Design a protein around this ligand. Structure first.
Ligand SMILES: CC(C)C[C@H](NC(=O)[C@@H]1C[C@H](N)CN1C(=O)CC[C@@H](NS(=O)(=O)c1ccc(NC(=O)c2ccc(C(N)=O)cc2)cc1)C(=O)O)C(=O)N(C)[C@@H](CCC(=O)O)C(=O)NCCCCC(N)=O
Ligand SMILES: O=P([O-])(O)O
Ligand SMILES: [Ca+2]
Ligand SMILES: [Ca+2]
Ligand SMILES: [Ca+2]
Ligand SMILES: [Zn+2]
Ligand SMILES: [Zn+2]
Length: 168
């Protein structure tokens, strides 16, 4: 079933804040923003968690792209291997999600990697979800493309364990 980080860390608030510092050239900026939004919404759908975008100063979830050493001491590794990473909820680095720009970022294709799926996956980590044993779960330790995506019961009960279900 579902898993969390060792000390079960979580946001002390439902109103979360995100900022996109950098883009990938692989996708249109507008299409990146829609991918990051839609990724936030798979989790917002089933919790009282609300993600609101800001365009300057420290946010909860600082989003960027980078390659190799990108100034956090967790280097990326070129094409494939690490696609991305997120930090468990916390101040500063806590919940910050980074994507390796040595990857080919795509949407709606089996070729390269869906920014939306990896982001959804990564944002799981940023809410305090670890990997899960269900091979169909979004918090699977493996990337898998599907054209038509739905949050598994495993991922819903895990996030609702921390933050409760949809009140709306
Ligand atoms: C940069 C990392 C080292 C940070 C780490 N986070 C992780 O270790 C996470 C959790 C887990 N251990 C995997 N993680 C990774 O960062 C690995 C990267 C990535 N690995 S991946 O590239 O091989 C990978 C694997 C799987 C996917 N999956 C998908 O994209 C995907 C899955 C499923 C589906 C589908 N079809 O359903 C579609 C797509 C994508 C990428 C991933 O899993 O995101 C972490 O949170 N810490 C070390 C924390 C430790 C926290 C703790 O232990 O309590 C830390 O010390 N942070 C310092 C400060 C933060 C807290 C504070 N403010 O005080
Ligand atoms: O490259 P991974 O994320 O499938 O291990
Ligand atoms: Ca890589
Ligand atoms: Ca942060
Ligand atoms: Ca790229
Ligand atoms: Zn990083
Ligand atoms: Zn992961």
């Amino acid at each position: 079933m579902y898993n969390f980080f060792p000390r079960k860390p979580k946001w002390d608030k439902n109103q979360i804040t995100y900022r996109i510092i950098g883009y990938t050239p692989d996708l249109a900026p507008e299409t990146v923003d829609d991918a990051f939004a839609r990724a936030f919404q798979v989790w917002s759908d089933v919790t009282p968690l609300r993600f609101s975008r800001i365009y300057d100063g420290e946010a909860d979830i600082m989003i960027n792209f980078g390659r190799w050493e990108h100034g956090d001491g967790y280097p990326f590794d070129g094409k494939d291997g690490l696609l991305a990473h997120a930090f468990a909820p916390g101040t500063g680095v806590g919940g910050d999600s980074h994507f390796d720009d040595d990857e080919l970022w795509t949407l709606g294709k089996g070729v390269g990697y869906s920014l939306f799926l990896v982001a959804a996956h990564a944002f799981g980590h940023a809410m305090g979800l670890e990997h899960s044993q269900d091979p169909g779960a979004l918090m699977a330790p493996i990337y898998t493309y599907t054209k038509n995506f739905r949050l598994s019961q495993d991922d819903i009960k895990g996030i609702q364990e921390l933050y409760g279900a949809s009140p709306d």
